Ligand binder design. Structure first.
Ligand code: ATP
Ligand code: ATP
Ligand code: CA
Ligand code: CA
Lengths: 366, 362
């Protein structure tokens, strides 16, 4: 009996089979329906909704990690089981993930749908950051999770997230793509359409990096061509990318670049640690673990180590852990968790759900 | 707000307040009712035994008489602890392999009969293990009514591997009575049973080599101890001292064909995966009143060494507190910050019902 792991994000669904080192299916968390359906019942999910976007209204059922459109979330889950993983959900225990401050009612609804619409034999809901931390081989540390829609700091002590100390930055991967489009248009190129967004996304993921000292790099890029990289557009046209390589992800450290007054990710990290008890801060500073697609920039751990060092006590041991496989560490932590012997008894079974109802899900220990 | 901890056993209730180092209330787990209405509990039921029919609501650790158990809980709250139970979260304990229906009924009664604001049910052996500073190990819990081995891996009792010996302290008392009577004394009445219990708890010990000690005992008087009876007669107890608890290792002494406590320990380990066997062998924790005999840890060490692979590191931990370690584990646990999260609340119970209790995590 193979368990399933589904990590539902704001931008991407990551789904697959417990025991694997990577999600088998990764696709856009988008549902499309024909314009004016409901005021006048077809629907499309992920790459297909995107490819058929022309007369569909496209929606993201999860916003900042939290499910907000239930009907469309059902379509995402259905598609995930039957089209992407090609499984009968009633044959498999299914681990799902949730965002840092997911309301109880939300968790209960997810639970009801899994058992009553999908008929899963068993399920579990884990905190995304705790899974990432587990994947890094720890039960204590502070997770920076930067995805497509939202960025969170989640301090965890001996297995337990500290909810009072969670910090949020309302910017992540999709904002960085849009800003790369903006500033790259400003050079003289034109990146504005949805096809051009796809290209820009590929540039972001291939050529961007976090500057160790931002002002030294701006100067270098202005002095020399040494920081410049070639890039071939789908049509064979080669173009050149300079300081926008590192200005784009600089937004995480300086959200003012997209007109936001929020604290950059180094500040959210510090702030989150400072909300925690002095007795555990040393442990958190030494176990700063980065996760999510938007932590993937070369140079980001180096830059964070520099910033945290500036904010923290002079003698604090600081360490930033950025695992190569951090892009899907939330999913991989789930894969690990759902595969080990000790967790077998942690699943919530259909019989338990039948006797207790959905609030059974809250009594949870991973 | 102070949480209550009630560890209900077959022979004794141990009850008190979390944060305390020991239970404030320890009394017999007995309810008496007139022979032909009022019921009495514990010491008062005993003082009235001549006009009451006395019953033990818990047998081998499992609650079997529910009306009488409700009387014990009521008396514990109101008369022993002097608390209104609707003002305190309450941690209760349970036997290994306590049935699900039983655990649910306990929960129902706490919320619906005693109106507790919150409660929890913890496995006795897990609490003992926790009190000793461990989350993996094998507990031997020997009480008044039953003996169990409970192997525990990272906080979780492994139910397929739990072993039981249907003899414990009350059996050893009776047996001491019998063999003292055979020596020529006579201990038959209930008054004489209390005397013999005192002798058992004061003068018995577990021999390292039984057959050597018997030979020593017949040889000289060097193992004889004097004991003043309440009336002031001084009697002599000899190989009595160690024959009595030898029953733990040799249940045949009282006509039982079951495995002794060294064999149940070993058998329990061997029902567990090889992956954790070394850690179990190194972390044998003794708990319960009937593990108090001087000599018992050394004798276990010997017996387990003989059964285990010759190279295996063996360690038997017998905390001086072990008579109340279940209770003390509960006290420690219920005082922790992170435990406030783990209580089942009345609102949770109202939403889910009694089956909510099983998703426990202590
Ligand atoms: N190598 C990379 N470099 C930079 N960005 C990347 C890289 N790989 C992925 N990303 C970005 O990461 C984002 C997807 O990450 P992730 O799956 O962690 O987010 P999510 O779970 O969908 O969203 P959220 O956690 O905000 O709800 C996309 O914006 C993607 O463009
Ligand atoms: N020092 C001692 N030496 C020997 N036996 C002792 C000693 N102290 C207590 N006992 C015995 O321990 C028994 C009670 O232990 P405990 O409270 O652990 O049992 P219980 O929880 O009531 O029963 P059970 O665990 O079997 O349901 C009594 O039979 C008592 O005589
Ligand atoms: Ca995510
Ligand atoms: Ca007991």
């Amino acid at each position: 009996t193979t368990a399933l792991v589904c990590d539902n994000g704001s931008g991407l669904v990551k789904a697959g089979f417990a025991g694997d080192d990577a999600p088998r299916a990764v696709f856009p968390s988008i549902v499309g329906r024909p314009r004016h359906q409901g005021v006048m019942k077809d629907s499309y999910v992920g790459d297909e909704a995107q490819s058929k976007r022309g007369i569909l209204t496209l929606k993201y059922p999860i916003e900042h990690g939290i499910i907000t459109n239930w009907d469309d979330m059902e379509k995402i889950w259905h598609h995930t089981f039957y089209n992407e993983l090609r499984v009968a959900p009633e044959e498999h225990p299914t681990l799902l993930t949730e965002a840092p401050l997911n309301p109880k009612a939300n968790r209960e609804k997810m639970t009801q749908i899994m058992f009553e619409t999908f008929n899963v034999p068993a399920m579990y809901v884990a905190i995304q950051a705790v899974l990432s931390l587990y994947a890094s081989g720890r039960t204590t540390g502070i997770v920076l999770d930067s995805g497509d829609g939202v960025t969170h700091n989640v301090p965890i002590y001996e297995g337990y997230a500290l909810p009072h100390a969670i910090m949020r930055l309302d910017l992540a991967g999709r904002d960085l793509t849009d800003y790369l489009m903006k500033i790259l248009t400003e050079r003289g190129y034109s990146f504005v359409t949805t096809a051009e967004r796809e290209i820009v996304r590929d540039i972001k993921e291939k050529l961007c990096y976090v500057a160790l000292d931002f002002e030294n790099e701006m100067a270098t890029a202005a002095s020399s061509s040494s920081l410049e990289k070639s890039y071939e557009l789908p049509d064979g046209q080669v173009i050149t990318i300079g300081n926008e390589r590192f200005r784009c992800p600089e937004t995480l450290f300086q959200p003012s670049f997209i007109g936001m007054e929020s604290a950059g990710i180094h500040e959210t990290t510090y702030n989150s640690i400072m909300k925690c008890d002095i007795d555990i801060r040393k442990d958190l500073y030494a176990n700063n673990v980065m996760s999510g697609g938007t932590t993937m920039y070369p140079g980001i751990a180096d830059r964070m180590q520099k910033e945290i060092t500036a904010l923290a006590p002079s003698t604090m041991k600081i360490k930033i852990i950025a695992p190569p496989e951090r892009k899907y560490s939330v999913w991989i932590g789930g894969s690990i968790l759902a595969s080990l012997s000790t967790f077998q008894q942690m699943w919530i079974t259909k019989q338990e759900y039948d006797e207790a109802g959905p609030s059974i899900v809250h009594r949870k220990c991973f």
